[PDB]
Amino acid sequence: QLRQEAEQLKNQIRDARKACADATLSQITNNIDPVGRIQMRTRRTLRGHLAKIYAMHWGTDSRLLVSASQDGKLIIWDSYTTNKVHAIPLRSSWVMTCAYAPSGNYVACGGLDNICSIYNLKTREGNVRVSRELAGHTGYLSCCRFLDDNQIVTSSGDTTCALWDIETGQQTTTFTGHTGDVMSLSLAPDTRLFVSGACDASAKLWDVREGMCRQTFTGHESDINAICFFPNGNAFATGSDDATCRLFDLRADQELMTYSHDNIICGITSVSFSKSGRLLLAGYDDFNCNVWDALKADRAGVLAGHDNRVSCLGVTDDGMAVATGSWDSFLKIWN
Amino acid sequence: AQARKLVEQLKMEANIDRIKVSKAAADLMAYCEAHAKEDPLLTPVPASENPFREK
Amino acid sequence: TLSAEDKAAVERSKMIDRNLREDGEKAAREVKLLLLGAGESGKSTIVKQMKIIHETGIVETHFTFKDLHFKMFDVGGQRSERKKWIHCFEGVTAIIFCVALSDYDLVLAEDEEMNRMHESMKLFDSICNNKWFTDTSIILFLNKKDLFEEKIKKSPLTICYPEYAGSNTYEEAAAYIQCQFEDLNKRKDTKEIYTHFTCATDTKNVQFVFDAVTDVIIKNNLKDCGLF
Amino acid sequence: MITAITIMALYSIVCVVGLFGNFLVMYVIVRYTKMKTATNIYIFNLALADALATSTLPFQSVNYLMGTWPFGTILCKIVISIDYYNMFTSIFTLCTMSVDRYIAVCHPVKALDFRTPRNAKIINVCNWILSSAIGLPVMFMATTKYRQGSIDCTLTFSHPTWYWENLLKICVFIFAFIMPVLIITVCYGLMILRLKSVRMLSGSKEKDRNLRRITRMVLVVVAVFIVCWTPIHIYVIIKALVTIPETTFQTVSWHFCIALGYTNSCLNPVLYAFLDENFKRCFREF
Ligand SMILES: CC(C)CCC[C@@H](C)[C@H]1CC[C@H]2[C@@H]3CC=C4C[C@@H](O)CC[C@]4(C)[C@H]3CC[C@]12C
Ligand SMILES: CC(C)CCC[C@@H](C)[C@H]1CC[C@H]2[C@@H]3CC=C4C[C@@H](O)CC[C@]4(C)[C@H]3CC[C@]12C
Ligand SMILES: Nc1nc2c(ncn2[C@@H]2O[C@H](COP(=O)(O)OP(O)(O)=S)[C@@H](O)[C@H]2O)c(=O)[nH]1
Numbered sequence A: 001q002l003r004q005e006a007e008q009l010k011n012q013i014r015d016a017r018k019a020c021a022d023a024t025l026s027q028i029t030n031n032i033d034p035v036g037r038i039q040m041r042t043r044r045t046l047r048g049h050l051a052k053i054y055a056m057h058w059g060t061d062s063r064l065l066v067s068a069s070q071d072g073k074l075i076i077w078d079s080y081t082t083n084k085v086h087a088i089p090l091r092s093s094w095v096m097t098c099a100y101a102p103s104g105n106y107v108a109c110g111g112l113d114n115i116c117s118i119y120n121l122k123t124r125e126g127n128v129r130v131s132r133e134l135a136g137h138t139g140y141l142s143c144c145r146f147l148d149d150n151q152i153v154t155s156s157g158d159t160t161c162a163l164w165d166i167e168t169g170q171q172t173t174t175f176t177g178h179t180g181d182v183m184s185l186s187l188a189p190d191t192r193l194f195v196s197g198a199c200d201a202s203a204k205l206w207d208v209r210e211g212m213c214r215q216t217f218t219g220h221e222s223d224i225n226a227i228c229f230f231p232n233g234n235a236f237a238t239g240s241d242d243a244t245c246r247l248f249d250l251r252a253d254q255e256l257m258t259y260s261h262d263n264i265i266c267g268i269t270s271v272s273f274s275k276s277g278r279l280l281l282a283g284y285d286d287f288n289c290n291v292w293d294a295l296k297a298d299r300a301g302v303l304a305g306h307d308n309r310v311s312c313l314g315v316t317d318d319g320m321a322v323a324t325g326s327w328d329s330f331l332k333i334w335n
Numbered sequence B: 001a002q003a004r005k006l007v008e009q010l011k012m013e014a015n016i017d018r019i020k021v022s023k024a025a026a027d028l029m030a031y032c033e034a035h036a037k038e039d040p041l042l043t044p045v046p047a048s049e050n051p052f053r054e055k
Numbered sequence C: 001t002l003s004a005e006d007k008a009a010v011e012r013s014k015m016i017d018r019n020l021r022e023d024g025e026k027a028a029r030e031v032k033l034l035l036l037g038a039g040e041s042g043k044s045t046i047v048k049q050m051k052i053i054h055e056t057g058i059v060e061t062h063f064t065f066k067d068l069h070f071k072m073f074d075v076g077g078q079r080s081e082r083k084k085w086i087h088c089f090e091g092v093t094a095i096i097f098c099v100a101l102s103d104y105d106l107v108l109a110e111d112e113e114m115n116r117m118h119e120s121m122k123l124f125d126s127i128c129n130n131k132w133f134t135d136t137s138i139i140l141f142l143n144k145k146d147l148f149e150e151k152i153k154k155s156p157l158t159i160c161y162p163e164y165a166g167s168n169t170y171e172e173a174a175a176y177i178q179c180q181f182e183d184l185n186k187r188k189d190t191k192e193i194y195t196h197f198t199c200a201t202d203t204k205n206v207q208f209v210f211d212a213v214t215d216v217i218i219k220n221n222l223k224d225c226g227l228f
Numbered sequence D: 001m002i003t004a005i006t007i008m009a010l011y012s013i014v015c016v017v018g019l020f021g022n023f024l025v026m027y028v029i030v031r032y033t034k035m036k037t038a039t040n041i042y043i044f045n046l047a048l049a050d051a052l053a054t055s056t057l058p059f060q061s062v063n064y065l066m067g068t069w070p071f072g073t074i075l076c077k078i079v080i081s082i083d084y085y086n087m088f089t090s091i092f093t094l095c096t097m098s099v100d101r102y103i104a105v106c107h108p109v110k111a112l113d114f115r116t117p118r119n120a121k122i123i124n125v126c127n128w129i130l131s132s133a134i135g136l137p138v139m140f141m142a143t144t145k146y147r148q149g150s151i152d153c154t155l156t157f158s159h160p161t162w163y164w165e166n167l168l169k170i171c172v173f174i175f176a177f178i179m180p181v182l183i184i185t186v187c188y189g190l191m192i193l194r195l196k197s198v199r200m201l202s203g204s205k206e207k208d209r210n211l212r213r214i215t216r217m218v219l220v221v222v223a224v225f226i227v228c229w230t231p232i233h234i235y236v237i238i239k240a241l242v243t244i245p246e247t248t249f250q251t252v253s254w255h256f257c258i259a260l261g262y263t264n265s266c267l268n269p270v271l272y273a274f275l276d277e278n279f280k281r282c283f284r285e286f
């Protein structure tokens, strides 16, 4: 019935993208100066996790981050002095995401319990306690990012993202449209769009203002495990299990660059950009992260020293730190 | 029910603007070269102002 | 050279390390168990039988028995892709795999064509022969005793397996189901399926699972001491 | 004649290979693998006792060679004290490693909390303290005496010498030959019976092969312990009981007994660390 016209509309979209694609990224950057041999060493190491760390997030003060692990502990790391600020006992032993507020007043975490827990960090009593229990999904909460101090956008196991009013504890819009289990999302710097990648090998841009999808990028093969916006908000990179990262454009809609090596087969768990955006650090699954030149697709360096799977990655806002979490219970701050 | 929804959603998605990929890639290149002096990991800084002093 | 604020930060981090060490010592003694099976077979019933005698998301149940603290991980509320969250259960002590004996001829609720027992067999295949459960022994609780008795006194078992040659008695049929549900694993030296038929015998269930946990704890201690 | 040269060769080769093996064990237990488990701490302490015991061998070897001790009273005082000290520390670390394995196998629910690196550390602390508590009498009571135009520094005793030397010799014998042997035999026997009866190690050819390997390594450990300790302890007790006439045969018997008692500490790293399965797993990593 309508499947044939849907298929020819697919073909029309691909034909429009082919016609609009006139020169690849690597053709114009053929004369750019490469970053060359890069070398980075472990300035700090945050020891104190006793189980499998799955995700972390930085802070906008570029000093305090938060980490989560299988033990059920939410440890706030002072990356300057390598200290512990808080230890929040999670009610769920299974978490694979956490978020840190730009205001710092709130912290979030979620996992196989399908519920996002919110804890208050600047409570008048001086301790940390639950403030709102954001429930309403039907799948595991695989990513969470604070839109601001009163909103969080979350990607869940029920193939739908959801903006959340943190005060009332209810959603305001639902981002249905994934034919596959969504894992990661990333927020635009202007905080009006967010792109989320799912297991159907497609990342979708969404309008945060009303709750509608704008593009879909189907370059990858297996399933999307990571995603991160560019600092200008007009591009993003996707991590996935097909041993390849991909850079996309929100406007040109094509696939700009591919980040793969024929000598590596394992998947990619986390991606984050630097300030300039020339530096994309993809946490691989060969026990280390990989430094990628985001214009030449050249592996500039390697970030080795992890005893287990690399689970999460994040570059701080002022770009002085590469915080790598891992399954071997050791965070490593790099510079 | 989902088939007509995806058809209408992707018909709405199809009729959007697409700027030339040379222009977008040049804008990405310009953003990268215009912030090269600001990125600490691309251009390393001496340990005087570095907040990560090993001990 | 540390000021008062740095001293307070160091003391707070030390206190957090102390409470964290106590919590890790508490949590390195607990016993972790993981429930699987088909959506109707046996998992909520066995955890309901468990909770009735000692007292969405993951359902948890904690209890004590012979000065050993156990844990229940019922993942029945995870209506999603099993592949992307199965790696979160590496450090579990043992797996309680609940299947149904009387599901060999029952037709699955979707498409009215696929068999329930063969679907449970495929699930057991994917769970036994994945990269995350190799050193973890799988307990198997072949439930639905009386229903299986009645349905094999009424109907032949050859409708499920078109190779059955034994009589329609309970012992030979249950032995056939057990051995065919055992030999499917591709690695028999390390994996040790401790099978136990049950319907409502609460005392035997906890003793059997404690025996299996004690065996895998013995194996872990033998790995720790370097003997094995 | 030439018997002293063969004794010198035996002492030299035992000391050299013991220090060689102990140095390899120290290097591989520090740099390659870590000491975050109870058994790693126990093997490290055993290697410490074995290296410290076998370093005093060339001192006694040149003591026999020159027939005199030109190294002063304080040096052989600390040598005798550290010899008794190292012999008890090696004995007690073997005994406590054995009882740790027995607790691990036969008492697993209790070993969930009784087997921690902190508990291993405090057991080693109590080990070396309880060895010091009996090596302290050997400290001040050892002295250098003069006899027959030669210098030797066997330790003396109090004014009633006979029951003092009898009591010290029988205390050393009963402790370091009834505490180790009986406890290690009963503990490894109970462990190997319960390890025969377990479901993981019965019902297949590979399970029986693992059973055979575990019983074999236990038997080799107890066998080399007995072979290295019995011919010297009873020789000491019969030299204390009756007066053996001075003959080259009894002197080379004494030297062979000392050499075997040090071959014990030579072979404990080989049969405790090189045969350990976790150490072999670390070996195959490179
Ligand atoms: C040298 C002799 C004569 C003096 C007595 C020293 C004693 C108290 C020393 C010597 C060897 C030491 C042990 C050597 C190794 C370790 C492992 C380490 O991770 C924790 C401490 C521990 C367990 C030590 C405890 C204290 C110890 C037993
Ligand atoms: C239990 C097994 C290992 C056998 C142990 C053998 C030991 C105890 C044997 C081997 C050689 C023996 C010595 C050989 C020679 C002599 C000279 C003789 O005029 C008196 C006995 C005496 C001094 C023996 C004492 C006991 C001795 C040291
Ligand atoms: N006669 C008999 N009935 C049994 C037995 N065990 C369980 N049931 C029932 O079979 C239904 C399946 O739903 P069930 O809860 O198992 O689904 P699930 O756990 O996968 S979510 C439950 O209502 C149970 O009362 C048994 O031995 N004998």
Ligand SMILES: C=CCN1CC[C@]23c4c5ccc(O)c4O[C@H]2C(=O)CC[C@@]3(O)[C@H]1C5
Binding pocket: D083, D084, D087, D168, D169, D170, D172, D173, D232, D233, D236, D257, D258, D259, D261, D262
């Ligand atoms: C192989 C060295 C072990 N030694 C410990 C101390 C001593 C010794 C041993 C066995 C039993 C003892 O009572 C005893 O005291 C000592 C003695 O009288 C001479 C022999 C020893 O140097 C030797 C073995």
